[PDB]
Symmetry: none
Subunit: 167 residues, 10 copies
């Protein structure tokens, strides 16, 4: 099922996303020549404040500084994404997002990356690091209750960029 | 993979979470034994197109309740997505108060079992299904996305089924 | 197994039919460029007066007005259809029919549209709306005891014709 | 799919609805144990050519009754179709009064079990079968559509079987 | 092994040795292209049962020839057996002079293809088949062993197929 | 479909009708328990070639009887065909008076079980089989159609088997 | 798995054999144009006198006169064949053999002719007659205790050669 | 062939030999019921690259012990290879004293079951897995060979899992 | 078909006839429960090359007997072949008097089970196998046909296994 | 699963090895025209002194005198090979090895030669003799507790060389 393997071309994806309040098309091949952090989350509009997701948006300047693209993804629709983005952060919404938020209503991307929780049709808290040649370098999958660190993600990305150059 | 919805056969069993009265509840088909059930699907929460079609079944639910009929809405959106759209006032394009349960089918299992899943998109077609007190499927309606359903026609069908249940065919 | 899927080309059919008191050949490809309503009924010569079938015939000018063809179908033969057509409505017959009545004695059409009641060799009360390009746009299937509405059928066909041009 | 009719083997069991004396009745093969049965098939009700062949078996049924032989007609048409054709006067190409049961095989099951179904049309070939008191198939006759059967020949075959049943072969 | 004989389908092809006019000949179904063919089976040479049934088809062959119809007898006995039986005087239970070919089906292939082989004995049932000028099977008759066939019925069937080939069905 | 005849294994069981002394009789393999059996097959009744080979086994049956040996002839022809050939005088190519049972195998079951059936013709090859008092198959002989069998050789074989049963080898 | 059928091509065979004291290659195709008698025996060096095998060698001139080849065969090796041939008949050996003695150490030939006694890896006393066209004409298989006759073998071959020319009597 | 490690499902069970406190022991996963387990993989003993990553998890084991968490290292090298590396001083590129069990997966079974085996080389990728007190897999981490793991991050994860086990989300 | 000889696994069970001390005897593996067994194969009786290799195992059998070790020779030749070769003087290439059983593997079952059958020829390669008191296969030796085995090496091996059975390694 | 059969081309192998303190590539085809002895051992760094392995290195001149290549192999890595080689023999190491020591971390070679002990991923003490044409001539497999003899190996190789020339 899962097509995500270390040292192998990262599973190709093409889907609709919300970026800068607009519906856009996002392909993996668009980021050829750059590092890519693809991260998944379970559900739009959860009761628990989406601080971990917001953290990746607020701190995106640090990733752009490193020439690194960051993509969020869930099994919710683009319409659901836009509504949550249009919900103020003080009301539990996402607010302004500086990164594209991908819709995976297909489940195809979650399936290809092996992060789909089958019985619920939601993605586990997975994070993947793809290099400029489209090769999968890192796999991170968390159970639903536990989020991810921007610091750890930056550590990983920089170490991979370093070792690409110096070994 | 395969549709399990056949006229004269037990309706595909379903068990999922739903929003009713602003709360998350568990809904099973077996909950409605002894009662007629109208199960209808819609594609997507938060669409820019007027949700008047879905709203009509909520607003006119007293007419269904008077016939002792349960009405269930269902999409592949989550229960959290449903609640947020329900909490959006109708002037803002939201659903407002819903007098019927809105089922979450993030699983896709219900849409698959009723044969209404549009595979390439993970959304349900505009399907509507009538299930009798014994859990037997009596009516299948599936519309392509652009065209909505009529409450009047749905009411005509369910009343015709209740009648013919007791007296055979009308002439 | 059923071949009828929304958004997919409608299951092709070719059979004999009674139209205007004669036996004719009817093919789906004959209706290319037009909306088509195909509806099924269980049996010729039932004791229950065939008012729902008659309604589609009587109100056919409304469908012709919208450039829509209406086809009736059962698993009875054309000979059975013709005899029922030659039976006056006074005596429970169909009378004059303004729409073709298709014969599906081999059951292939009912099977392809998923409306065959296997144990009886009769079709459930199915109705299908096919667009000018031959694409299936609507599925309706009723259990035997419940008929269909011409008004609802007109609502659906006009809504599809409209959304084909304008969107919503 | 497969014919079940074999000489010297139990005749394919059948159970279906029929028209007899203007009424809908149930007919089972087991009803005729201890008695010879002639079961014959015809293609279509309301045929354009006069149904003289079928009528002959009805008109001459007293000759079968005197030999204690039951005679059954069968087609893939419905029981409602049969009744209407029976109610059509013989002057107008109808069957008129039938002294024998006319079986409905809308299933195609009986025609299939007897291997007389013309698949591409869902109609039976002109088959005739003679079944003995023990339910054993003794004779198979199947004609292509255009050619009918003889009551005289059927009578010859049946009384020959009855005769050989207690006296052995004839010469 | 199963029957290949189906109404409206090409009659099972056959090629075997036969006795005709006191000599061994080769017979193929294709030899009779353009003509109606009656192929009939009988169980056994040299039986103590009066072979009048087989002889009737030979004695009355001129009536078939008049109609341009070929008649073929066949059993699972050899050509050598056939010839010896033919050379036995009728008054000693022989066939005597035959006016029709008597086919040998020792390897049972023909009886199997026509579905008339009584498996436990390696003999044919009293089957008779009518094949049209195009090689299409039009009629199937299979009798249990104790009851013989009628030349008159066979002539009726053949003339009816010939008649209906030209005109269709008539009153 | 498949031959059941194997040396050292129970000879394929058979039960069929036969002509013996002008009458129809039932013949079973089990009828010959405690006795040697020579079962031999031939292709066809009423051939143009004189059946001297088959007649030899009948004419010299006393030699087999003296050794307590049963001899059985068999073909795919019916019991009615056998009788008619038996009633045909030897002067006219018939079998004449037969002193051994002539088995009918219209079934083909016996010829198939002994692996002597010529499939394309539904006749047996000239097979001969020796079966001991315990029903165990001791000897297999199958000839192509043109060549017959020897009574002397058959007697040599059955006597050698009867001797070996008591004494062992040479 | 027996490939031996009357009226069908005789199972092809190719193996090592002892002929005139030396190891040779024998093939069925060598015999195209001639009748061939192939016969099997169980074992070299048995306590039972090998008169049955010896008889086919001693009387080989009668076969050669009729232009008929004779082959003996067992599952023993060509080495034990030679050793048995080099043993005087005096001491229970074969002595000089005038016919090839094939070694079927494979069991392939015994398997193909349906004469292999599986549990023991030895051949039953089978004998087979093959015509000039390679067609199998005769099958003979004896249980171990009973031998075969040269006279009967000569009768069979001559009758096949005769019928080949003239048909039946 | 196939990975058996799935979030929310029981962690792939294992029994293998390990070096613990300079001695050979038998380690079973079922032994750790009631405790959180961090299982991490490394490619090879005796690499020229400093084993600072593996050393960190041993040096900082008191932090895991205080959280009642077991830490297990694993590679496809043998226990004899492990012990020789442990007996090699850190100043000579060895591991020195280890405070955590070092599992031997010469079998490759554990690396296969956790989907971390680099097939063509018979070495494990830098995988790390968190297994709860009930044996349920809660976290999957797999790094390409060139990049190491963080004890701080590992500590963050396990504490968050322990925390939400009692309280739910923030 | 398939070899069943695996180190550390129960040795393929065998049962056949053998020539031993002027008689044909039955030999089974189970007869040797409680002692070491050396089973060795050779290609052919009556080869032109002196069987010095096979004779050595017979001549030096007292050395095996003193260690409580049974020695068995085996080829695909029959007991009658074995006997005749034993009856052949060593001066004329025979085996002469044998002090060990020579097994006959005529149906090839043993050679197949030990994976030493040269299939195209129906002969065994020069295989030698050591089986312990419990029936466990401890050693596999297979030589191509031209090269023989050493009694000294076989003695070394069996004594080493006997020793380590009680002591472990040095 | 074993590909090792007498009289058939020896299973091909290509792997990394330690030779003269360095990492080298070893292919079977490198030894075309020479006899090859390939022998397997279970484990680097065992408590039992590796005398049998050392014997094949110490006595390699005798093999080279006969134009015979000798190769040792285990499922251990090239890194632990080197470390064991760099351990003096008085401390239980291999010391100076005059023969290449192959790494079979793959298990591929051990599987191909039918010497892998599956439950442990170690090779049995197998020894194999391959001729100048690449044909397998001899199979030796010992259970773990018992070692190989250099004298026997030399006897076998010389007997094979001898019969190659004289028959």
């Amino acid at each position: 099922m899962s097509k995500a393997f270390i040292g192998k071309p990262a599973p190709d994806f093409a889907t609709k996303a919300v970026f800068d309040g607009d519906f856009v098309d996002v392909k993996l091949s668009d980021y050829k020549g750059k590092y890519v952090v693809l991260f998944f989350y379970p559900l739009d509009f959860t009761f628990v404040c989406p601080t971990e997701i917001i953290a990746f948006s607020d701190r995106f300047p640090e990733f752009k500084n490193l020439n690194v693209a960051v993509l969020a993804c869930s099994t919710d629709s683009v319409f659901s994404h836009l509504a949550w983005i249009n919900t103020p952060r003080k009301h539990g919404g996402l607010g302004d997002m500086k990164i594209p938020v991908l819709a995976d209503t297909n489940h195809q991307i979650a399936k290809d990356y092996g992060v789909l929780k089958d019985d619920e049709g939601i993605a586990y808290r997975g994070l993947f690091i793809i290099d400029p040649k489209g090769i999968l370098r890192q796999i991170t999958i968390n159970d639903l209750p536990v989020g991810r660190s921007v610091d750890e993600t930056l550590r990983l990305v920089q170490a991979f960029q370093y070792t690409d150059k110096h070994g």
